[PDB]
Structure 1
Amino acid sequence: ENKDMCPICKTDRYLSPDVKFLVNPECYHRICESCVDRIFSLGPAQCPYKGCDKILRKNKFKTQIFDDVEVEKEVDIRKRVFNVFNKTIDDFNGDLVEYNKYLEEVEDIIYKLDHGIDVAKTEEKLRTYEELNKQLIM
């Protein structure tokens, strides 16, 4: 937060926190404009956010401004899952139990995705997304 907002500018709340601390949809990290720009400009290099080695991508970042990254992961994961499972049957005929259960199943992957317990079911959730994406293509 006020003590971790970048590899470079970790303390940025009182350093005019107007510059953008982007999460790469694959970084989930607080990267001040200096480092994140430095990175995607050269390209997908890691954001050195506190020993980090995860590739701060090229210009594919999203916006997450300090939204409790446990939520930012929980928010970024749910939308893609809710997009991968976009409308797998939820209003095909108007059912409320199955749709909500399918909904109760829908974000249960996201809750698992936001958790990633011992991951072997999150991988199973990914195969469902590929199955959901394969079903979407057809």
Structure 2
Amino acid sequence: MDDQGCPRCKTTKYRNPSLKLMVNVCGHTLCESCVDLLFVRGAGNCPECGTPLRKSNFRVQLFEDPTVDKEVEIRKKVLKIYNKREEDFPSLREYNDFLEEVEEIVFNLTNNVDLDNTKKKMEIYQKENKDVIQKNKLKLTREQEELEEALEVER
């Protein structure tokens, strides 16, 4: 808890056990005390480098979710651009051999590997694909049809 450090106030974790902690996008953990203390002094800048914080991209929580910094970054990188790859690959693969590369590339991405610039070129490659969201719309339509069919049986 107190071993990860604290940006500005530095004196907050020792005052309240049930503290509301928040996260950002670059990969840091700032409590609710550092949110208001930094806004009245500056804005939304990273205490280590330079990450702008304009929109309300903070996830408020009081259950102390970011326990280990290594396991919280791999959960955000997959549900961003790697979650959409769960549909394109099965349309061309044929055996469980390429799925090990997805699980491996996300393990080394946290341990500082130069291969981070390689995956950024694929995101800018094609500009017309969409999908993903179109697949979630069909599941919601079929769910409403089942609820309407179950309501007719009760009637």
TM-score by length of 2: 0.60
The RMSD of aligned alpha carbons is: 3.2
2:118 equivalent in structure 1: 124
* Closer, same or farther: CA 135–112 of 1 in aligned 2, 3 Å: farther
CA drift at 1:137 = 3.1
Q: Does 1:136 align with 2:129?
A: yes
What corresponds to 2:83 in structure 1?
83
Matched-pair contact (CA < 8 Å) for 1:77–1:113: no
Choose the corresponding residue for 1:113, options 109, 121, 140: 109
- Contact kept, 8 Å, 2:12 with 2:33, in 1: the verdict is no
**Counterpart of 1:66?**
66
Q: Structure 2: how far apart are the matches of 1:45 and 1:37?
A: 13
Q: TM-score, normalised by structure 1?
A: 0.66
Question: Does the 8 A contact of 1:40 with 1:57 survive in 2?
Answer: no
1:9 paired residue number: 10
Partner deviation per Cα, 1:3-55 (whole Å, 9 max, x = no partner): 3352123661x5324333222111x2221101134446864322x3xxx2343
In 2, distance between residues paired with 1:62 and 1:73?
Answer: 14
Show the counterpart of 2:136. none
Identity of aligned residues (%): 22
Contact 1:24 1:60 in 2 (8 A): yes
Which residues of structure 2 form unaligned runs of 5+?
A: 132-155
**CA–CA distance in structure 1, aligned partners of residues 17 and 50 of structure 2:** 24
> Partner letter of residue 79 of structure 1?
L
Q: Are residues 34 and 76 of structure 1, via their aligned partners in 2, closer, same or farther at CA, if it must alter by over 3 Å? A: same
Runs of 5+ unmatched residues, structure 1: none
Q: Is the 8 A contact 2:22 2:58 kept in 1?
A: yes
Q: Is the 8 Å Cα contact of residues 74 and 110 (structure 1) preserved in structure 2?
A: yes
Change (3 A) 1:116 1:127: farther
Contact residue 73 and residue 110 of structure 2 kept, 8 A: yes
| 94 and 84 in structure 1: CA distance in 2 versus 1, 3 angstrom threshold | closer
Q: For 1:73, what is the secondary structure of its paired residue?
A: helix
The residue matched to 2:29 in structure 1 has which SS?
Answer: coil
